[PDB]
Amino acid sequence: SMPALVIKTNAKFTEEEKSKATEELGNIVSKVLGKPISYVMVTLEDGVAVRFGGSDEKAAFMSLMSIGGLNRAVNKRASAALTKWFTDHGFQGDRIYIVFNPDWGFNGDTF
Amino acid sequence: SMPALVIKTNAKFTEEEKSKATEELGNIVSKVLGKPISYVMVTLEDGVAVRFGGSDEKAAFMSLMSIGGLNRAVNKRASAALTKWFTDHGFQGDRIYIVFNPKSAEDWGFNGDTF
Amino acid sequence: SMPALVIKTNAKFTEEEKSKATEELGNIVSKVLGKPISYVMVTLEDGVAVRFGGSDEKAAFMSLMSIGNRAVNKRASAALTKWFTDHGFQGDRIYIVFNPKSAEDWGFNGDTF
Ligand SMILES: [Cl-]
Ligand SMILES: [Cl-]
Ligand SMILES: [Cl-]
Ligand SMILES: [Cl-]
Ligand SMILES: [Cl-]
């Protein structure tokens, strides 16, 4: 099983800031889900036109895919840990949007 | 209970046009789904390499996620209403692609908490 | 029915390279799934910040959605990856997602199925 985190935001990040974010956010996913960082895939797209709640204020949309291992308990801890990274980096917690989505391919073969 | 709309297109929009698109498209989703505009999330990515039907002509790809409130009936009106915005803004109706994806409250996060 | 392929990668493609990729990748999807090339939708986003397995080396993320298998999944995984390994990518840096949907959860030309 290998988790995936897809992030879209209207904030502007530098090339270094994006590199640190995918590292820090990927490590958060590794901790909450109990998987090694080797199995973690992180995608970050900045400068995206976003409107959340009628406003185009700084916001982020996130999707967390993982074959299994997602439950009411884990989703709440992942929501809190992922959101704090953003609230610690200039974001507002009410502008952060997370979807959990638990049939996968890797190196040309399925599992 | 909050819907999400993710839009990818190869057209080039100005910053003002992108702001207008997310507002108009967001209000379309609010009307069709029966939610206030406060709960609507809209994402618009322009200038993405798109090929639909072998051609890289002007096209758009769309995904609509919503905690519940997604049914065979609603999806049909949402498909029609969203397409009309594009056909009214320089797109051709046969180049528009929509995917509907309902999810649960436990599988959704907001303000560091689920539902 | 109608397949959809959404690709995210941190590699930098030229405008011509992107056009060739969506054609070649689109044709691979049409062949493996047994559907005409007319119903295939391909999206390619380059220059996306990607970190896979802790490393930000060249990588690609893929999602393949289709209304409604073990046979295709093996062929689609292998055929799509081979395109990338033939274009400077590493096969263990290629990430594919299969997402079957229902007829009522798909839209085209303002109507569902
Ligand atoms: Cl920079
Ligand atoms: Cl812990
Ligand atoms: Cl996406
Ligand atoms: Cl501009
Ligand atoms: Cl160029």
Numbering used by the authors:
A (entry chain A): 13 to 114, 119 to 127
B (entry chain C): 13 to 127
C (entry chain B): 13 to 80, 83 to 127
Paper's wording?
Each monomer was refined with 115 amino acids. The r.m.s.d. for superposing Cα atoms of TvMIF trimers with the hMIF-1 trimer is ∼1.1 Å, while that with hMIF-2 is ∼1.2 Å. The hMIF-2 structure has an inhibitor, 4-IPP, bound in the tautomerase inhibitory site in the amino-terminus.
T. vaginalis evades host immune responses by producing homologs of host proteins, including cytokines such as macrophage migration inhibitory factor. T. vaginalis macrophage migration inhibitory factor (TvMIF) helps to facilitate the survival of T. vaginalis during nutritional stress conditions, increases prostate cell proliferation and invasiveness, and induces inflammation-related cellular pathways, thus mimicking the ability of human MIF to increase inflammation and cell proliferation. The production, crystallization and three structures of N-terminally hexahistidine-tagged TvMIF (His-TvMIF) reveal a prototypical MIF trimer with a topology similar to that of the human homologs (hMIF-1 and hMIF-2).
